[PDB]
C-alpha cells in the first residue's frame, strides 16, 4: 500500500499542522567550493538591476562611477526587479509620512538619536557582529578589530583620548587626509612589526567590505552570502541605524524594532481595526508579501537624500554626521573572495589563483565565468570590485524597514482606495480594501507600482494572497487561530554550554518562556525536560544513583549512595534523579531540592570556601582551544595579553571594578597607588602587619612611580 | 560627498537645497498611472492557473540511498550487556568478537561492487585490529583509502612561463550534480520504519519527575503513552543507532585525531515480555548493525567508511553507491533455517555540523509531540472536556492509499508517520530540501485558500514551480515529498475542484 | 600580609613595561570599562557542540588550586589521576570528578542560614508556590494577549540607577561615592541590607548581581487570562495558556500588591488637599508630597521617591507625578477609564452649542480600558466613526460604551438637559466652573436612568443577519433583537498597545496637565471619594487634616 503523509492535510486546517512542513529537526546547509562566483554574479545582478547606462568618471578614483537615481533606462521586463529610485517621489513618501504622524516627527526622532549617541562611549562599538579588520585584512570579532584599529592610530600618531563616538568619528575622518598610516602587522622570519601604508591604499582598505559564505541561514538551496563591513565605516552606520530605530519604534505599521510575542498582537490590533474600519459596500482582501533581492535594489545614494531630508531642521552639527554614513556605501569597495582553480583532465595538477590575478588568465576560464567577468573589468581594482548603487545586506535593516513603512504609510481619492499592513525589512504583509472585486486588482496594482517606483520589488513568484483569514509573516501563519509552532526555537532547547547548574536552570526557563510565548503544550514541555535532562546527563557524563551504568564519575557515587538518607533530594550533577517539573520550571533545581537535601550534603556542596536565573555552586571556565595560539594571531594577541594582566591587576585592587564601571577624574595607576597606600595604612594602624613591611610597601609604590614617570 | 550625489546637481549644497526646500505636489498620481502602464503588472487569478501544470519532476536514473546507514535491509547481532563491560562502548565489539563475528569472511568476487579488493583488505585490517586494539596500524593505506584524491599545487609566479608555453594541458572547469528520478523503495522504507520492531526501546530516555495531580498527571501520562508507542518502532531503532554511533565518532574525533580507528555501529535495547508469567527478567541488551571506520582528513569534513550486515538481496537501482559482498550465511529462527549473509560497504563524508545535528536525533520526538498534542487540545477545548484520550483513539488521520482507495488510521498509529517524517527530515537534510519546503509552504497556503473557499491567487506560478523544480535535484526525500504532494493535489482536486489532474 | 605586597610588586612590574605604563597613565579610570571590553573570553561559534567536545576529555576544566591544597587530598580513592604541577594562568588544571568528591567528603559546617536570604528573590518565589490549592479543567480560552505587567514582584521595588547605588554601598565601603539622594532618604533598607551582607565576606560579585534582580520587576509584554495580579504572573505557564486552566490562586500574594493600592488612596487625598484651596495648585501640592512620609511593611520611605518611581500609573498617580520631574507618558486617564492613542492627529477647536466647548477634529483611533472590559474606538470630526467591544461583563461593556461616547462628544451630548444648570454646571470650589465633558460624565455617574438616557441617545436599529454575535443590546447582551448603531461586540478580548516613551510638562492651576502641548491627560478629579481612613501613614505641616492636639 501507498503511504502519503500529505493526505492528512485534506480534512484538517493547515495552519495548525504547518510546523510539520518545516524540517528544523535536522541540520542546516553548508558552504562548498568558492564564494567568488556568487559575489561576481550578485555584483552583475546589482548593476543589471540598476537600470541605467549613465556612467561618470570619478575625479578621485579614475574609475567610472555609475550613479543611478531618477535617470531610468527602462527595460521591457518591468515586472523583473528594479534598482532605480525616484528621489523626488521618495521625499514625497517622507513628507506624507511625516504629515501622517505629527509635524516634528523626524526632528524628535533625531533628537533622541543625537542624545543617545552623543552620550555613547566608543567602547560600546565593540558590541555587535563580526567585522572587517583592515590591519591584517581579515574578518574579526568587532572588539579585537577595534583594538587593532585604535592601537594602530596610537602607534601612528599617539594615544587616542576621545572617549566618545563623536571624537572617534572625527579621528576617522581625520585619517583619510593622512598621507601615511602605520600598522601592527605580523611577519615571520626563518614576529610582529610595523608596516606602513599610503592614503591611496588606505582609503580603499577602509571602504573595503568582506564576503562571508553563508552559514546558519534556513531554507535555501543556493547560498545568499553576507557582508561584514570595516571598522571605520561601522560607527556612522550605527548612528543611522539608531535614527532609523527611533523612527521605526514609533510606527504602528513597523514590525522590526518590535519582535517575538509583541509582533503577534501588532497584527491582531490592526486586523480588528481594519475589520471595524470596513463599510458595507467595501471589500477587504489580504496578501502575503515576500521580496526578492531587497538589498541589491535599495541604494545608499537615495538614503543620503532621505537622511538629508530628515536632518533638515534638527541640527547642522549632526546633519553632517548623518550624511557621512551613506557616502561610504555610495563609494564602497567589495572584496571578491577565495578565487578560481585550474585543473587538467588528469586530477593530478591544480593551479590556485588569487582574486588579484584573475585578469591574467582572461580567456583560459570557461565562458560563463568570462561573460560575467568582462564587464566588471571596468569597475575592478587589484584585489577588489568598486560598486556604488547596490546596498550590502544586513547593515541598514532599520532604515530599510523605515522606507518600507513609508510606502504603506497611506493618496488619490478613489472609491475603495485603501491599503495598509505590516513590514519587517524585506518581508511585508498587505491588506487591500476596495468597493468591488474588480477594483481590488487595480488598487493592489497601484501599490506595487508605488513600491517598485522606489526599488521595493515584490517577489512575483513567492508572494500570494486571499480572503483576509489566511496569511504568513516571518514563519507566523494566521487564521482565526494564531500560529502554534515550536519549529522556530528548536536548537535553543539543547544544553546552552556554560556550566552544569547554569545550563539546566537556563534550559528550564527557556522551556517555560517558549511554553508561554510560542504556546507549546505541556506534555511537550515535559518531554522537552526529560530530553534536555538526558542530553545534559550525556553532555556532562553523569547518571542517576539507581542507574546501573558505571563510569569514572559514577564510580565515586557507589561509595556516596550509602551515606545520604534522602537520595532523591540530591542534585543531578552529583547523580541525583529529576525533581523539577512543569509547575516548578520557574524554580532552579538547587532551590527545589534544597529543603529535602541532607544537612552534610547541603553544607558541603554550596560552601563558599571551595575549589569552585543563575545558580552558584558550580561555576567554571572552559579552556580555549590550542588553535588560535599556534598561528600568527598569537603574535598579535601579545598586545591583548598586556591589556589582560593590567585589568586583572586593577580588579585585584578595586573589587567593584567589574560591577560598577570605575569613574572619577584620575588615572588608573594614580588611583591604584593611593588605594594601595590606604589599604596598607588600614592594615598597619589597627590590623596585624609590621611597620618596616609597610615602609617596604611604600618603597615598592614609590619605586613603581619612577618607572611609571619615565614613560 | 560632492561627487556621491544622485541628482543632476553636482555640489552637495544644491542637493541640500532641493532636499530642505522640498514640497511635493500630487503629480505622483500621474507618475504612478504612467508607471502602471509601463508596469503591465500581472493581475492574476487562481481559477485561471488552477492547474499549476501539476508538479514537474526530473527524469533519469532512480535516486540512490543517501542515508549514511542502511535501515530496512540492515541486520542485527544481539548481545546481552554487562554494565561494566558495556560501559566502555568501544569494548562492545571486542566482546562481540569472542562470539561468532570472528568467523565471517567475504569472497574476493563481489556482486555490484566498485572497489572490491580495497574494502576486502580493509575488512581484514579491521578484524586484525579488533583482536589487539581497535586502531588500524597504517600510515600509507590510510592516504589511499581517504583518496578513493590529492592535487599538487603550482605557484602563479613560475606559471607565467607555462601559460606562454602551454604544458600539462592547462584549463579551468567546475562540475554539477547529475539529476535523478523518483524513488520506489522509499515507500517500502517508510512502511518498514512505521511498524513495531520486536525489540522494545532504543533511544535512552531519562526518568519522570514527581507530579502534582493537576497538570503533571496529564503530561506524565501523555508522555508515558507516546514514548511507549514510539519506542517500539523501527524508526526509533535507527535514531538509537544514529545517536549512539555518531556519539561514539564524536568522542573519537577528540580522542585520536589524525588517526585511523574502528568504531562499531550499535544500538542499545531492552526486550520486554508481557506473557503474564514471572520470567527471569525483561532482557537487557545491545545489538550490532555493522562496523565503521574513521579517517581524519582535510578543520573540516571527516571521511567515514561504513560496513553493514544484511540478510536481503541488494538492489542495483538504489544501492548504486553501495559495494556489496557475499559474506557467508547466518542463522535466523522462530517457533510457535540459515539464510545467506550479505555485507554492504561504502564510503561517505561527515561534516562536524552533521555529526552534531545527527547525534541529537531525539529532537524529532518533540516536533512530533507538539504537533500531536496540539490537535488533541484544539479538539478537546471545543467541547470543554478531557478529549485527549478519546481524540487519540477516535480521530482519524488520512495516512495512505491502497487498491485505489484512501486509507486513514487513528492518530496514535498515524503519529508514527509524523515521527518517521521528522526523522527523515533530520537524515535527508540537504540545501535542496530546505528550499523545497520553504517554497512548498506557498502551495499549501494556496491549497487551504481553496479549501475554505477564499478565492486565492498567485502572481507567477510558472515562476514558483520553476523555483520548486530548481531545488529538485538528487534528494530522495525531497523528490518523494514532491511526488506525494502531486497525489495530494490530485485527491484534493477530486474532493473540491480548484486544481488539475492530467 | 604578602597579599598586599605581591600586588604592589606586580604594579612595579607592569609600570616598568612602558607600553602598559603609558596606557595606565593616559586618560580617566573609565577606560577600564573599555579595556575589559577588549577581551572576549573565547570563540562562541558552536555552543552545545563546544561543550560536548569540552567535557569529553577527562582533565580540561580550569580550577582553584590553593583552597583544595589547604582543605583536602588532591590524590584519588580509585587510583585515577586528579592533580599535576603543569600549567598561562595561576589556576592549575584538574579533572571533573574531584569537584563531586569534595561535595561528598569535604569538611564543612553551618552555611545554611547564610544562603537563602542572599537569594530571597528565588527562595521566596519557591516559598510562594507551597501555599496554594489546585483544580484542573479545559476550555477554548481567550487570553489577554499584551499587558506590560510587572512579573517577579518584590517589596521596595526601585529604578536601575538608584539600585546600583545600593549595590555599591552594600558591596563594599572602601570604594564608594558619597551618594546623597538615595542614602539620606531611603536609609533603613540600607542598614538592613548592608548589615546582613557586609559582615561575612562571601561571593562579593555574585550577591551584588542577584540583588539587582531581587528588586527588578521584569515588566515584559505577555499574554494573561484575567488574573492580573503580579504574583500570578511569575508562574502563568503552569496556570494556563490558550487551552489550559488552574484554580485557587488569588490568596497567596506578597504584601506589595495592596500596598500599591494604598498609595493610590494616599495620592487621592493628597490631591484633594490641593483641590480644597485654588489660590494656587502648583506651590501647595508639592509641599503635601515632599512632607508626607510612607511606612512600608519593613521600612520608612518618602512619598516623593515612591510616587516618582512607582511602576503603576493611575489617574491620581499621574497627577501626583505631574508636580515632580517624573516622566511617565503613554498613559491617558479619563475618570475611572484608561485610554491609549494609536492613530492620527488634529487640533483642539472651540464650538459653542446649546444644551463654550472644546472639540477635537481628528480621524483618531484609540484603545479603551475599563474594569473587566476592553474595547477599540475611532473618532472622526467630534463623532464616533468605528467601534468594537471586547468586554467580559455586560454592565462594564455598557460603562465602556457610555464613557467612550462622553469623550467622543456627539450633538446628542447637548440634547439631554435634566437639571445640570442647577448643580453640575458650577462646581462649589471657590466659584470654579468645572469643564464640560466631566460635567455630563458626573451627570451619568449620578444615577441609573442617566446611563439609560444617553445609551438611548445613540441610533438604535434591529441588526442584520451576520451581526447576531456582534450586536450589542441596551442591557449589555448579545441577543441582537434590538441594538446600538456604529458598534459591534467581539467574541473575545482586545489587545492593548504599548510604547517605550517618556513625556512631561507642567500642570495648569486647576489640576490639569496640558502635556504634549494639549491632550487633557489629567482628568482633573477622577473620583470624589470623601473618606479619611489611614493606617501607619505619616503627614506633616498644616496638613488641613486635624490630627494635631495642642
What CA–CA distance (Å, rounded) separates B234 from B191? 10
Nearest residue to B176 via CA among A60, A368, A145, C385: A368
What CA–CA distance (Å, rounded) separates A388 from A202? 18
CA angle B336, B341, B346 (to 5 degrees): 135
Q: CB of A643 within 8 Å of any CB in chain C?
A: yes
C398 and C258 within one domain: no
Residue A345's Cβ-count burial label (10 Å; 0-12, 13-18, 19+) is exposed
What CA–CA distance (Å, rounded) separates C74 from A561? 22
C416 and C367 within one domain: yes
- Best of C3, C8, C94 to substitute, by most chain A Cβ atoms within 10 angstroms, is C8
Query: Which three cell numbers mark B135?
Result: 586502531
Tally of residues, chain B: 502
Query: Which three cell numbers mark B401?
Result: 492509499
For A493, which residue in chain C has the nearest alpha carbon? C48
Nearest residue to A607 via CA among C106, B332, B350, B388: C106
- Best of B90, B211, B212, B214 to substitute, by most chain C Cβ atoms within 10 angstroms, is B214
Q: How far is CA B2 from CA A53, A58, A87, B8, in A?
A: 21, 11, 17, 12
Helix H or strand E encompassing B79: strand B77-80
Q: CB of B98 within 8 Å of any CB in chain A?
A: no
Q: Mind giving me the DSSP string for A265-312? A: HHHHHHHHHHHHH--SS-EEEEEEE-BSSHHHH--HHHHHHHHHHHTT
Listed by number, the residues of chain A in 445-484 with a beta carbon closer than 8 Å to a beta carbon of chain C are: none
How far off is chain B from A434, nearest CA to CA, in Å?
15
Q: CB of B460 within 8 Å of any CB in chain C?
A: no
What CA–CA distance (Å, rounded) separates A520 from A483? 10
Q: Mind giving me the DSSP string for A58-120? A: -TTTSSEE---BS-----S--SS----B-HHHHHHHHHHHHTTS-SSHHHHHHHHHHHHHHH-
C353 and C475 within one domain: yes
Tally of residues, chain C: 550
Contacts of residue C99 in chain A, CB cutoff 8 Å?
Answer: 611-612, 618
Query: Which three cell numbers mark B187?
Result: 515507500
Beta bridge partners of B329: B340
For B356, which residue in chain C has the nearest alpha carbon? C49
Nearest residue to A75 via CA among B31, B40, B43: B40
What CA–CA distance (Å, rounded) separates B382 from B395? 14
C274 and C247 within one domain: no
C325 and C263 within one domain: yes
B244 alpha carbon, distance to own chain's centre: 17
Q: Which of B250, B254, B381 sits opposite C243 (nearest CB)?
A: B381
Resolution (A): 4.3
Q: CB of C42 within 8 Å of any CB in chain A?
A: yes
Largest Cα separation within chain C, whole Å, is 101
CB contact under 8 A, B215 and C244: yes
> Collapsing DSSP states into helix, strand and coil, what is residue B353?
helix
CB contact under 8 A, C49 and B352: yes
What CA–CA distance (Å, rounded) separates B174 from B152? 18
What CA–CA distance (Å, rounded) separates A459 from A291? 5
How far off is chain C from A175, nearest CA to CA, in Å?
21
Show the DSSP H helices in A565-615 as ranges: 589-594, 599-606
Q: CB of A609 within 8 Å of any CB in chain C?
A: yes
Nearest residue to B81 via CA among A546, A549, A541: A549
C336 and C193 within one domain: no
Q: How far apart are the first and last CA of chain B?
A: 61
Contacts of residue C205 in chain A, CB cutoff 8 Å?
Answer: 658-659
Contacts of B344 (CB under 8 A, 6+ apart): B70, B73, B290, B306, B307, B308, B309, B310, B314, B319, B322, B323, B324
CB contact under 8 A, A350 and B152: yes
Contact between residue B309 and residue B327 where contact means Cβ atoms under 8 Å apart: yes
Contacts of residue B214 in chain C, CB cutoff 8 Å?
Answer: 134-136, 246
> Collapsing DSSP states into helix, strand and coil, what is residue C460?
strand
Within 10 angstroms of residue A167's Cβ, the number of other Cβ atoms is 14
What CA–CA distance (Å, rounded) separates B104 from B123? 10
Which subunits count as partners of chain A given 3+ CB pairs below 8 Å? B, C
Q: Which of A25, A304, A331 sits opposite B425 (nearest CB)?
A: A25
C346 and C398 within one domain: yes
Q: Kindly report the backbone phi and psi dihedral angles of residue A550, in degrees, each rounded to the nearest multiple of 5, phi listed first.
A: -115, 150
Query: Which three cell numbers mark C520?
Result: 487633557
CB contact under 8 A, C203 and A616: yes
Contact between residue A432 and residue A444 where contact means Cβ atoms under 8 Å apart: yes
C311 and C258 within one domain: yes
DSSP-assigned letter for residue C470: T
For C54, which residue in chain A has the nearest alpha carbon? A622
Which subunits count as partners of chain B given 3+ CB pairs below 8 Å? A, C
Check the CA dihedral B241-C51-A516-A618 and report its sign.
positive
Q: CB of A646 within 8 Å of any CB in chain C?
A: yes
Residue with cell 510562594: C128
What CA–CA distance (Å, rounded) separates C511 from C504? 15
> Collapsing DSSP states into helix, strand and coil, what is residue C154?
coil
Q: Which of C32, C103, C106 sits opposite A650 (nearest CB)?
A: C32
What CA–CA distance (Å, rounded) separates B193 from C230? 49
Helix H or strand E encompassing B477: helix B476-495
Q: Which of A163, A560, A671 sits opposite C104 (nearest CB)?
A: A560
Contact between residue A379 and residue B203 where contact means Cβ atoms under 8 Å apart: no
DSSP-assigned letter for residue B135: B
C350 and C486 within one domain: yes
- Best of A121, A498, A611, A644 to substitute, by most chain C Cβ atoms within 10 angstroms, is A611
For C48, which residue in chain B has the nearest alpha carbon? B356
C464 and C382 within one domain: yes
- Best of B371, B380, B386, B496 to substitute, by most chain A Cβ atoms within 10 angstroms, is B371
Nearest residue to C232 via CA among C134, C153, C311, C286: C153
What CA–CA distance (Å, rounded) separates A613 from A509? 8
Q: CB of C56 within 8 Å of any CB in chain B?
A: yes
Q: Which of B251, B352, B377 sits opposite C243 (nearest CB)?
A: B377
Contact between residue C494 and residue C388 where contact means Cβ atoms under 8 Å apart: yes
Amino acid at each position: 500500500m501507498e503511504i502519503n503523509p500529505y493526505l492528512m492535510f485534506l480534512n484538517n486546517d493547515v495552519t495548525s499542522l504547518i510546523s510539520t512542513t518545516y524540517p528544523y529537526t535536522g541540520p542546516p546547509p553548508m558552504s562548498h567550493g568558492s564564494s567568488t562566483k556568487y559575489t561576481l554574479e550578485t555584483i552583475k545582478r546589482t548593476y543589471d538591476y540598476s537600470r541605467t547606462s549613465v556612467e561618470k568618471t570619478s575625479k578621485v578614483f579614475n574609475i567610472p562611477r555609475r550613479k543611478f537615481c531618477n535617470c531610468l533606462e527602462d527595460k521591457d521586463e518591468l515586472v523583473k526587479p528594479t534598482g532605480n529610485v525616484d528621489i523626488s517621489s521618495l521625499l514625497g513618501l517622507a513628507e506624507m509620512m511625516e504629515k501622517r504622524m505629527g509635524e516634528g516627527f523626524f526632528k524628535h526622532c533625531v533628537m533622541e538619536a543625537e542624545t543617545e549617541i552623543l552620550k555613547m562611549h566608543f567602547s560600546r562599538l565593540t558590541e555587535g557582529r563580526q567585522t572587517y579588520d583592515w590591519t591584517s585584512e581579515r574578518n574579526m570579532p568587532a572588539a579585537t578589530a577595534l583594538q587593532l584599529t585604535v592601537d594602530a592610530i596610537k602607534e601612528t600618531e599617539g594615544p587616542f583620548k576621545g572617549t566618545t563616538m563623536l571624537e572617534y568619528c572625527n579621528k576617522m575622518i581625520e585619517m583619510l587626509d593622512w598621507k601615511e598610516i602605520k600598522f601592527k602587522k605580523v611577519k615571520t622570519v626563518v614576529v610582529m612589526g610595523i608596516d606602513s601604508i599610503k592614503h591611496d591604499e588606505f582609503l580603499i582598505r577602509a571602504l573595503t567590505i568582506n564576503t562571508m559564505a553563508k552559514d546558519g541561514e534556513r531554507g535555501k538551496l543556493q547560498r545568499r552570502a553576507i557582508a561584514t563591513p570595516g571598522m571605520i565605516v561601522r560607527p556612522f552606520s550605527k548612528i543611522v541605524e539608531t535614527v532609523a530605530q527611533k523612527i521605526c519604534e514609533k510606527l504602528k505599521e513597523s514590525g522590526l524594532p518590535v519582535g517575538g510575542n509583541e509582533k503577534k498582537a501588532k497584527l491582531k490590533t490592526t486586523v480588528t481595526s481594519l475589520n471595524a474600519r470596513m463599510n458595507s459596500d467595501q471589500f477587504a482582501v489580504n496578501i502575503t508579501g515576500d521580496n526578492s533581492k531587497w538589498n541589491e535594489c535599495q541604494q545608499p545614494e537615495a538614503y543620503l537624500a532621505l537622511l538629508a531630508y530628515i536632518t533638515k531642521d534638527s541640527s547642522d552639527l549632526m546633519k553632517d554626521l548623518c550624511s557621512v554614513a551613506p557616502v561610504l556605501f555610495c563609494n564602497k569597495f567589495v572584496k571578491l573572495g577565495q578565487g578560481i582553480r585550474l585543473s587538467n583532465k588528469r586530477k593530478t595538477k591544480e593551479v590556485i589563483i588569487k582574486a588579484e590575478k584573475m585578469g591574467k588568465y582572461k580567456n583560459l576560464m570557461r565562458e560563463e565565468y568570462k561573460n560575467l567577468f568582462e564587464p566588471l573589468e571596468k569597475y575592478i581594482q587589484k584585489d577588489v570590485c568598486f560598486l556604488p548603487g547596490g546596498m550590502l545586506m544586513g547593515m541598514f535593516n532599520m532604515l530599510s524597514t523605515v522606507l518600507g513603512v513609508s510606502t504603506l504609510c497611506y493618496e488619490l481619492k478613489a472609491k475603495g482606495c485603501f491599503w495598509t499592513g505590516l513590514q519587517s525589512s524585506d518581508d511585508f504583509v498587505l491588506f487591500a480594501v476596495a468597493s468591488n472585486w474588480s477594483n481590488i486588482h487595480w488598487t493592489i496594482r497601484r501599490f506595487n507600482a508605488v513600491c517598485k517606483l522606489i526599488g521595493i520589488n515584490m517577489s512575483l513568484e513567492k508572494s500570494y494572497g486571499s480572503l483576509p483569514e489566511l496569511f504568513e509573516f516571518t514563519s507566523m501563519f494566521f487564521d482565526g487561530e494564531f500560529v502554534s509552532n515550536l519549529a522556530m526555537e528548536l536548537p535553543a532547547f539543547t544544553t546552552a554550554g556554560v556550566n552544569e547548574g547554569v545550563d539546566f536552570t537556563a534550559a528550564m526557563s527557556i522551556i517555560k518562556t517558549n511554553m508561554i510565548n510560542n504556546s507549546l503544550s505541556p506534555s511537550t514541555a515535559l518531554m522537552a525536560l526529560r530530553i534536555c535532562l538526558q542530553e545534559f546527563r550525556a553532555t556532562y557524563r553523569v547518571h542517576p544513583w539507581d542507574s546501573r551504568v558505571k563510569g569514572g564519575r559514577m564510580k565515586i557515587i557507589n561509595e556516596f549512595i550509602k551515606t545520604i538518607e534522602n537520595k532523591d533530594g540530591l542534585l543531578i550533577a552529583d547523580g541525583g534523579k529529576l525533581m523539577n517539573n512543569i509547575s516548578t520550571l520557574h524554580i532552579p533545581e538547587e532551590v527545589l531540592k534544597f529543603e529535602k537535601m541532607d544537612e552534610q550534603y547541603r553544607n558541603r556542596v554550596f560552601n563558599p570556601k571551595n575549589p569552585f536565573a543563575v545558580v552558584s555552586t558550580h561555576s567554571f571556565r572552559t579552556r580555549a582551544n590550542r588553535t588560535l595560539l599556534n598561528t600568527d594571531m598569537r603574535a598579535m594577541m601579545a598586545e591583548e595579553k598586556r591589556y589582560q594582566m593590567v585589568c586583572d591587576m586593577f580588579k585585584s585592587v578595586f573589587e567593584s571594578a567589574d560591577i560598577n564601571p570605575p569613574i572619577g577624574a584620575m588615572s588608573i595607576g594614580e588611583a591604584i597607588e593611593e588605594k594601595l597606600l590606604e589599604r596598607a595604612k588600614m592594615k598597619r594602624d589597627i590590623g596585624a602587619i609590621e611597620d618596616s613591611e609597610y615602609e617596604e610597601i611604600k618603597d615598592i609604590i614609590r619605586d613603581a612611580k619612577k618607572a611609571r614617570l619615565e614613560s | 560627498r560632492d561627487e556621491s550625489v544622485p541628482l543632476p546637481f553636482q555640489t552637495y549644497e544644491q542637493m541640500k537645497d532641493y532636499c530642505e526646500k522640498f514640497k511635493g505636489n500630487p503629480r505622483e498620481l500621474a507618475s504612478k498611472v504612467s508607471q502602471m502602464q509601463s508596469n503591465i503588472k500581472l493581475p492574476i487569478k487562481h481559477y485561471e492557473q488552477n492547474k499549476f501544470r501539476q508538479i514537474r519532476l526530473p527524469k533519469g536514473p532512480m535516486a540512490p540511498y543517501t542515508h549514511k546507514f542502511l535501515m530496512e535491509e540492515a541486520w542485527m547481532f544481539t548481545k546481552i550487556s554487562d554494565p561494566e563491560r558495556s560501559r566502555a562502548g568501544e569494548i562492545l565489539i571486542d566482546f562481540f568478537k569472542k562470539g561468532n563475528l570472528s568467523a565471517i569472511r567475504p569472497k574476493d568476487k563481489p556482486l555490484q561492487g566498485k572497489y572490491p579488493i580495497h574494502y576486502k583488505n580493509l575488512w581484514n585490517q579491521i578484524k586484525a585490529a579488533i583482536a589487539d586494539r581497535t586502531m588500524v596500524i597504517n600510515e600509507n593505506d590510510h592516504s589511499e583509502f581517504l583518496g578513493g584524491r590529492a592535487s599538487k599545487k603550482i605557484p602563479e609566479i613560475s606559471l607565467t612561463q607555462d601559460v606562454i608555453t602551454t604544458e600539462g594541458l592547462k584549463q579551468s572547469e567546475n562540475k554539477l550534480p547529475e539529476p535523478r528520478s523518483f524513488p520506489r523503495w522509499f515507500n517500502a522504507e517508510w512502511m518498514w520504519a512505521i511498524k513495531d520492531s520486536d525489540l522494545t526501546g532504543w533511544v535512552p530516555m531519562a526518568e519522570y519527575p514527581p507530579a502534582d495531580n493537576e497538570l503533571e498527571d496529564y503530561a506524565e501520562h501523555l508522555n508515558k503513552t507516546m514514548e511507549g508507542v514510539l519506542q517500539g518502532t523501527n524508526c526509533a531503532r535507527e535514531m538509537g543507532k544514529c545517536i549512539l554511533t555518531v556519539g561514539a565518532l564524536m568522542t573519537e574525533c577528540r580522542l585520536f585525531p589524525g588517526k585511523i580507528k574502528v568504531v562499531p555501529i550499535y544500538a542499545r535495547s531492552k526486550e520486554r515480555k508481557s506473557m503474564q508469567e514471572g520470567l527471569p527478567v525483561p532482557s537487557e541488551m545491545d545489538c550490532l548493525f555493522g562496523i565503521c571506520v574513521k579517517s581524519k582528513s582535510h578543520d573540516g569534513m571527516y571521511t567515514i567508511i561504513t560496513f553493514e550486515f544484511s540478510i536481503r538481496e541488494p538492489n542495483l537501482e538504489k544501492h548504486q553507491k553501495y559495494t556489496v559482498f557475499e559474506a557467508g550465511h547466518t542463522t535466523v529462527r522462530m517457533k510457535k533455517r540459515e539464510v545467506p549473509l550479505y555485507l554492504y560497504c561504502r564510503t561517505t563524508a561527515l561534516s562536524k555540523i552533521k555529526n552534531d545535528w545527527l547525534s541529537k536525533a531525539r529532537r524529532c520526538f518533540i516536533t512530533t509531540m507538539d504537533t500531536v498534542e496540539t490537535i488533541c487540545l484544539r479538539e478537546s477545548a471545543k467541547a470543554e472536556e478531557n478529549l485527549v484520550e478519546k481524540t487519540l483513539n477516535e480521530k482519524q488521520m488520512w495516512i495512505g492509499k491502497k487498491n485505489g482507495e484512501l486509507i486513514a488510521q487513528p492518530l496514535r498509529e498515524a503519529l508514527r508517520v509524523q515521527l518517521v517524517q521528522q526523522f527523515y527530515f533530520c537524515i535527508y537534510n540537504d540545501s535542496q530540501l530546505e528550499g523545497f519546503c520553504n517554497e512548498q509552504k506557498k502551495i499549501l497556503m494556496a491549497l487551504e485558500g481553496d479549501k475554505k473557499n477564499k478565492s486565492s491567487f498567485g502572481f507567477n506560478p510558472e515562476g514558483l514551480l520553476e523555483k520548486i523544480e530548481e531545488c529538485l535535484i538528487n534528494n530522495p526525500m525531497c523528490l518523494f515529498m514532491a511526488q506525494r504532494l502531486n497525489e495530494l493535489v490530485i485527491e484534493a482536486s477530486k474532493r473540491g475542484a480548484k486544481f488539475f489532474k492530467t | 600580609m604578602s597579599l598586599l605586597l605581591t600586588i604592589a610588586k606586580e604594579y612595579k612590574r607592569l609600570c616598568q613595561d612602558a607600553k602598559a605604563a603609558q596606557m595606565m597613565t593616559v586618560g580617566t579610570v573609565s577606560n577600564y570599562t573599555t579595556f575589559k571590553k577588549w577581551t572576549t573570553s573565547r570563540k562562541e561559534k558552536n555552543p552545545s557542540l563546544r561543550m560536548r567536545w569540552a567535557m569529553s576529555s577527562k582533565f580540561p576544566i580550569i580550577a582553584n588550586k590553593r583552597m583544595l591544597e589547604e582543605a583536602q587530598i588532591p590524590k584519588e580513592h580509585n587510583n585515577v589521576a586528579l592533580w599535576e604541577d603543569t600549567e598561562k594562568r595561576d589556576h592549575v588544571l584538574a579533572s571533573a570528578s574531584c569537584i563531586n568528591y569534595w561535595n561528598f567528603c569535604g569538611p564543612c559546617v553551618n552555611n545554611s542560614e547564610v544562603i537563602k536570604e542572599v537569594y530571597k528573590s528565588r527562595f521566596g518565589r519557591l516559598e510562594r508556590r507551597k501555599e496554594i490549592m489546585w483544580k484542573e479543567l479545559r476550555f477554548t480560552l481567550v487570553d489577554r494577549q499584551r499587558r506590560r505587567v510587572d512579573t517577579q514582584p518584590v517589596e521596595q521595588r526601585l529604578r536601575t540607577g538608584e539600585i546600583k547605588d545600593l549595590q555599591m554601598w552594600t558591596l563594599f565601603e572602601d570604594e564608594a561615592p558619597l551618594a546623597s539622594k538615595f542614602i539620606l532618604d531611603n536609609y533603613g533598607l540600607v542598614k538592613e541590607m548592608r548589615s546582613k551582607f557586609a559582615n561575612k565576606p562571601l561571593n562579593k560579585e555574585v550577591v551584588a548581581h542577584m540583588l539587582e534582580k531581587q528588586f527588578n520587576p521584569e515588566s515584559r509584554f505577555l499574554p494573561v487570562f484575567g488574573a492580573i495580579r503580579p504574583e500570578r504572573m511569575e508562574l502563568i505557564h503552569a496556570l494556563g495558556g490558550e487551552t489550559w486552566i488552574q484554580e485557587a490562586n488569588t490568596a497567596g500574594i506578597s504584601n506589595v500588591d495592596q500596598r500599591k493600592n494604598d498609595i493610590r488612596a494616599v495620592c487621592r487625598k493628597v490631591c484633594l488637599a490641593a483641590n480644597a484651596s485654588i489660590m494656587n495648585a502648583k506651590s501647595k501640592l508639592v509641599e503635601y508630597i515632599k512632607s508626607t512620609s510612607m511606612r512600608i511593611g519593613e521600612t520608612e520611605r518618602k512619598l516623593e521617591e515612591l510616587i516618582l518611581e512607582t511602576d503603576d500609573v493611575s489617574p491620581e498617580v499621574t497627577l501626583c507625578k505631574s508636580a515632580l520631574g517624573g516622566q511617565l507618558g503613554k498613559t491617558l486617564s479619563f475618570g475611572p477609564m484608561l485610554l491609549k492613542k494609536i492613530s492620527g492627529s488634529g487640533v483642539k477647536v472651540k464650538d459653542t452649542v446649546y444644551i463654550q466647548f472644546e472639540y477635537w477634529s481628528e480621524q483618531e483611533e484609540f484603545y479603551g480600558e475599563y474594569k473587566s472590559a476592553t474595547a477599540l474606538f475611532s473618532r472622526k470630526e467630534r463623532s464616533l466613526e468605528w467601534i468594537t467591544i471586547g468586554g467580559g461583563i455586560n454592565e462594564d461593556r455598557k460603562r465602556l460604551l457610555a464613557m467612550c461616547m462622553i469623550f467622543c462628544r456627539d450633538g446628542d451630548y447637548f440634547k439631554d438637559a435634566p437639571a445640570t444648570i442647577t448643580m453640575a454646571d458650577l462646581s462649589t470650589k471657590l466659584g470654579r466652573e468645572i469643564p464640560y465633558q466631566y460635567v455630563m460624565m458626573n451627570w451619568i455617574q449620578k444615577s441609573e436612568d442617566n446611563l439609560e438616557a444617553l445609551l438611548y441617545s445613540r441610533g438604535i436599529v434591529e441588526t442584520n443577519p451576520g451581526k447576531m454575535g456582534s450586536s450589542m443590546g441596551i442591557d449589555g447582551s448579545k441577543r441582537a433583537i434590538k441594538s446600538l448603531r456604529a458598534v459591534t461586540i467581539q467574541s473575545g478580548k482586545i489587545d492593548m498597545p504599548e510604547s517605550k516613551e517618556k513625556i512631561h510638562l507642567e500642570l495648569s492651576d486647576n489640576l490639569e496637565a496640558f502635556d504634549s502641548s494639549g491632550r487633557i491627560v489629567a482628568t482633573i478629579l477622577d473620583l470624589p471619594s470623601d473618606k479619611k481612613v489611614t493606617f501607619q501613614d505619616v503627614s506633616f505641616q498644616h496638613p488641613d487634616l486635624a490630627v494635631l492636639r495642642d
